[PDB]
Design an enzyme around this catalytic site. Structure first.
Site, PDB file in Angstrom:
ATOM      1  CB  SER A   1      -0.952   0.010   1.189  1.00 32.04           C
ATOM      2  OG  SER A   1      -2.023  -0.914   0.964  1.00 32.04           O
TER       3      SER A   1
ATOM      4  CE1 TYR B   1      -0.741   0.900  -6.665  1.00 34.88           C
ATOM      5  CE2 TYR B   1      -0.265  -0.254  -4.644  1.00 34.88           C
ATOM      6  CZ  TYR B   1      -0.452  -0.255  -6.015  1.00 34.88           C
ATOM      7  OH  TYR B   1      -0.325  -1.448  -6.693  1.00 34.88           O
TER       8      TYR B   1
ATOM      9  CD  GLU C   1      -2.674  -6.050  -6.482  1.00 28.79           C
ATOM     10  OE1 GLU C   1      -3.695  -5.610  -7.024  1.00 28.79           O
ATOM     11  OE2 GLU C   1      -1.534  -5.862  -6.960  1.00 28.79           O
TER      12      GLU C   1
HETATM   13  C1  5ME Z   1      -6.910   5.822  -8.698  1.00 22.10           C
HETATM   14  C2  5ME Z   1      -7.763   5.239  -7.509  1.00 22.10           C
HETATM   15  N1  5ME Z   1      -6.774   4.889  -6.498  1.00 22.10           N
HETATM   16  C3  5ME Z   1      -6.485   3.673  -5.958  1.00 22.10           C
HETATM   17  O1  5ME Z   1      -7.126   2.625  -5.937  1.00 22.10           O
HETATM   18  C4  5ME Z   1      -5.076   3.795  -5.450  1.00 22.10           C
HETATM   19  C5  5ME Z   1      -4.313   3.018  -4.493  1.00 22.10           C
HETATM   20  C6  5ME Z   1      -4.179   1.711  -4.160  1.00 22.10           C
HETATM   21  N2  5ME Z   1      -4.044   0.657  -4.988  1.00 22.10           N
HETATM   22  C7  5ME Z   1      -3.772  -0.564  -4.435  1.00 22.10           C
HETATM   23  C8  5ME Z   1      -3.661  -1.672  -5.289  1.00 22.10           C
HETATM   24  C9  5ME Z   1      -3.352  -2.896  -4.754  1.00 22.10           C
HETATM   25  C10 5ME Z   1      -3.159  -3.062  -3.390  1.00 22.10           C
HETATM   26  C11 5ME Z   1      -3.226  -1.927  -2.547  1.00 22.10           C
HETATM   27  C12 5ME Z   1      -3.535  -0.708  -3.079  1.00 22.10           C
HETATM   28  C13 5ME Z   1      -3.626   0.420  -2.252  1.00 22.10           C
HETATM   29  O2  5ME Z   1      -3.389   0.432  -1.047  1.00 22.10           O
HETATM   30  N3  5ME Z   1      -3.910   1.612  -2.854  1.00 22.10           N
HETATM   31  C14 5ME Z   1      -8.698   6.202  -7.249  1.00 22.10           C
HETATM   32  C15 5ME Z   1      -8.364   7.518  -6.876  1.00 22.10           C
HETATM   33  C16 5ME Z   1      -9.366   8.472  -6.649  1.00 22.10           C
HETATM   34  C17 5ME Z   1     -10.688   8.111  -6.823  1.00 22.10           C
HETATM   35  C18 5ME Z   1     -10.992   6.816  -7.236  1.00 22.10           C
HETATM   36  N4  5ME Z   1      -9.973   5.837  -7.463  1.00 22.10           N
END
Ligand code: 5ME
Length: 354
Positions: free
Chosen positions: A244, A247, A336
């Site tokens: 995490s 990100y 994930e």
């Molecule tokens: C671009 C999306 N952001 C995420 O989903 C980001 C971060 C995220 N991805 C992961 C993927 C696999 C495992 C963990 C994570 C995580 O902790 N954060 C987003 C951002 C703003 C509004 C809607 N969706």
């Protein structure tokens, strides 16, 4: 007549948080990091209509990517007219791969949350008439409609959370814990209580851009029409903080780099495990409540503890990652954890890390 500004009710840590998550510098920084032209697209000028037109332009690109229609270059050029980009005043590049398409969708999802925070801050009519106003940081906290309570060292869950962070964070340069807030976004409550029969709850990490923290606090973790990733259209979490943390987009403040990470309680129920990417997923298979893309490693399950949250037992990993031989050939180095209904997650904690 001049309005009284009432004294701020917030503790220092919370004042800094509220400052950071609504900071115009932070938002513009984020736009620069995403290659957007902030001169042509200032914060106050961002609109829902523009963002919607940007998604329409990407939808046309996606159709083209999958007959005498417009070229990818032509369709790219329209996207870049709608959403101004800056590449040192050279031409922006054509959106001609799935990877770049999703990257532009993800940019617009972040931009939509920046626009949400701006729309939230709009001055209401009541506010123009009242003769006293809250301190600006109280006003901003109030707009979230989200209770935040700063924890101290000896809150019951504090050591448990610190242990989760330390044990599953990077071995070299683990993020340094500064603060933890308990998060209570009410009326996540009603929809979450729906899954009260569903067992198998786990407290999981979710890292994000600083620019979307206000939106998440206001609206919860969401699934949007153009959300995607290696496990499809859901909400992504990790059991390993280091996954995490990748990100987390932080910001330089003084001599340090400040970032924010959430912990969500996720009602995983019956798990479907996968070992190869599937970006087409929109739900678990029938009779499953979640999809776990299983990693080569997992926090040592023998070290799991539990916290009691709203009378339910919630698993919290406490172990260093160990190898899982059944998943040694997985396409995922780290797990994930996916849910495909927003109601299966409740925000529980927010951490500031340097
Ligand atoms: C671009 C999306 N952001 C995420 O989903 C980001 C971060 C995220 N991805 C992961 C993927 C696999 C495992 C963990 C994570 C995580 O902790 N954060 C987003 C951002 C703003 C509004 C809607 N969706």
């Amino acid at each position: 007549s001049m309005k009284r500004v009432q004294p701020c009710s917030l503790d220092p840590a919370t004042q800094k948080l509220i400052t950071n998550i609504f900071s115009k510098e932070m938002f513009k920084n984020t736009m620069a990091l995403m290659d957007l032209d902030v001169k042509k697209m200032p914060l106050g000028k961002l609109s829902k209509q523009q963002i919607a037109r940007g998604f329409e332009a990407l939808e046309a690109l996606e159709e083209a990517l999958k007959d005498g229609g417009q070229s990818l270059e032509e369709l790219s050029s329209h996207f870049y007219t709608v959403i101004p980009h800056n590449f040192g005043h050279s031409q922006p590049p054509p959106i001609n791969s799935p990877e770049l398409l999703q990257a532009k969708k993800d940019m617009l999802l972040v931009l939509a949350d920046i626009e949400l925070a701006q729309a939230l801050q709009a001055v209401s009519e009541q506010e123009k008439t009242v003769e006293e106003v809250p301190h600006p940081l109280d006003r901003d906290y109030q707009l979230l409609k989200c209770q935040l309570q700063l924890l101290d060292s000896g809150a019951p869950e504090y050591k448990v959370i610190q242990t989760y962070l330390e044990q599953t964070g990077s071995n070299h340069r683990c993020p340094t814990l500064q603060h933890i807030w308990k998060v209570n976004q009410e009326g996540e409550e009603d929809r979450f209580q729906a899954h009260s029969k569903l067992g198998n709850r786990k407290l999981l990490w979710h890292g994000t851009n600083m620019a979307v923290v206000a939106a998440i606090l206001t609206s919860g973790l969401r699934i949007m029409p153009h959300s995607g990733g290696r496990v499809g259209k859901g909400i992504y979490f990790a059991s390993e903080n280091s996954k995490s943390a990748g990100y987390v987009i932080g910001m330089k403040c003084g001599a340090h780099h400040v970032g924010y990470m959430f912990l969500g309680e996720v009602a995983l129920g019956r798990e479907h495990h996968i070992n190869t990417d599937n970006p087409s997923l929109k739900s678990p298979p029938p009779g499953f409540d979640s999809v776990i893309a299983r990693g080569h490693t997992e926090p040592d399950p023998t070290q799991d503890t539990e916290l009691e949250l709203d009378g339910q037992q919630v698993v919290v990993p406490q172990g260093q990652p160990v190898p899982c031989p059944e998943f040694s050939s997985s396409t995922f180095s780290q797990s994930e954890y996916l849910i495909y209904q927003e109601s299966q997650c409740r925000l529980r904690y927010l951490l500031e890390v340097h």
